[PDB]
Design a protein around this ligand. Structure first.
Ligand SMILES: NC(=O)c1ccc[n+]([C@@H]2O[C@H](COP(=O)([O-])OP(=O)(O)OC[C@H]3O[C@@H](n4cnc5c(N)ncnc54)[C@H](OP(=O)(O)O)[C@@H]3O)[C@@H](O)[C@H]2O)c1
Ligand SMILES: Cc1cn([C@H]2C[C@H](O)[C@@H](COP(=O)(O)OP(=O)(O)Oc3ccccc3)O2)c(=O)[nH]c1=O
Ligand SMILES: [Cl-]
Ligand SMILES: [Cl-]
Ligand code: NA
Length: 325
């Protein structure tokens, strides 16, 4: 019997990625979709099925909901994950899970006490391309790794976007910079430590719109991370090694049908490998539903989410903040 999923917040990411995955996944059934406006709920259910619900508390009270997907603005994640967990629902929370490490520990504790899964939906972790890259690096294709760079920058969102409100969307670090920071954790491991960063704050709206961070492992393998929403589109990572370098585009949000290309360069020789296409949004939703159904809640997911939250806090706290103009 599929797990019955309810959605709180009719989010663009829900309409674009999450809900088509839920609807097509045999293991999950969309039973209710809640919105602050019934009309918006209803438009979502007409598209993806389930009962449309006005307001979020009503959905949490439902007996036919087993798990709740929370694609709310970052700043609002915590209140509603806490309430969904106390309603007895497992939770798939969008990235970033929350805004800081102590808040994240408290949410995992509420979950832990009730045996419930809380999962941060970094769907890109579920795309096989990253492990195919890590396997090439482990095979020595570029020698020992010296440093890492990752970038996710996008052109400015329309006025009114959730990201232009510090206390709803919380801006380019919480909502975009979390990606390169997460890829640095995936590839360089659990001992990354903050070294320096810059955050550009737009005075007009009072929100972070771009930044760059420098992290290091204790062996001095550095990560240089760029993020922002005042920029042309970039979405890439690159490794510099002792005998070569490796890079790739569309690393955080490859289409379901899009075939990645790994680029390698070494002295007098370069290569590109075409990898198979995969649907990372389907795979992450599948992973969630299998954990819920089996009761096997991987310990690494919550430990990585906690470390991720610490590094984000370390960047925010450590950065030089520059306001413009
Ligand atoms: N499309 C994306 O930008 C995108 C991509 C990947 C990940 N994410 C992550 O997914 C989450 C949502 O992002 P999104 O981009 O899909 O945002 P979005 O389209 O603004 O969706 C946020 C949803 O939250 C609800 N909400 C509740 N209080 C709100 C408020 N005060 N202001 C605005 N919305 C409010 C709204 O649902 P109702 O009006 O129906 O209540 C809104 O549709 C974030 O954690 C983000 O970091 C977003
Ligand atoms: C391909 C592409 C996208 N965008 C814009 C369009 C969009 O505003 C932004 C990101 O598009 P995407 O990488 O598809 O990621 P999701 O929207 O799935 O999730 C996020 C949404 C917002 C922040 C981060 C991730 O880039 C471009 O400007 N050019 C491009 O070639
Ligand atoms: Cl993702
Ligand atoms: Cl390319
Ligand atoms: Na600071």
């Amino acid at each position: 019997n599929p797990i019955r999923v309810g959605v709180i917040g009719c989010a663009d990411i829900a309409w674009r990625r999450a809900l088509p995955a839920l609807e097509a996944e045999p293991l999950t059934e969309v039973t209710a979709i809640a919105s602050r406006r019934w009309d918006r709920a209803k438009r979502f259910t007409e598209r993806f099925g389930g009962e449309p619900v006005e307001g979020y508390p009503a959905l949490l009270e439902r007996d036919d909901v087993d798990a709740v997907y929370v694609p709310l603005p970052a700043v609002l994640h915590a209140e509603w994950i806490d309430r969904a967990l106390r309603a007895g629902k497992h939770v798939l929370a969008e990235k970033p899970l929350t805004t800081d490490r102590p808040q994240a520990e408290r949410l995992f504790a509420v979950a832990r006490e009730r045996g419930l899964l809380l999962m941060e939906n970094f769907m890109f972790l579920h795309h096989p391309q990253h492990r195919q890259v890590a396997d090439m690096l482990d095979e020595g294709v570029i020698g020992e790794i010296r440093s890492f760079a990752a970038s996710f920058t996008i052109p400015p969102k329309p006025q009114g976007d959730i990201r232009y409100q510090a206390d709803v969307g919380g801006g380019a670090l919480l909502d975009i910079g979390v990606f390169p920071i997460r890829a640095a954790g995936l590839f360089l491991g659990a001992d990354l430590e903050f070294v320096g960063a810059v955050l550009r704050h737009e005075r007009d709206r009072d929100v972070v719109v771009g930044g760059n961070a420098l992290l290091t492992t204790r062996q001095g393998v550095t990560a240089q991370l760029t993020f922002g929403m005042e920029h042309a589109y970039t979405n890439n990572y690159e490794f510099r090694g002792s005998t070569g370098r490796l890079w790739m585009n569309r690393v955080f949000t490859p289409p379901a049908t899009y075939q990645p290309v790994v680029h390698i360069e070494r002295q007098d020789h370069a290569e590109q490998f075409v990898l198979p296409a995969h649907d990372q949004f389907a795979k992450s939703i599948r992973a969630f539903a299998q954990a819920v159904l089996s009761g096997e809640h991987p310990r690494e997911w919550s430990e990585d989410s906690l470390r991720q939250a610490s590094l984000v806090d370390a960047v925010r706290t450590g950065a030089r903040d520059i306001y413009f103009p």
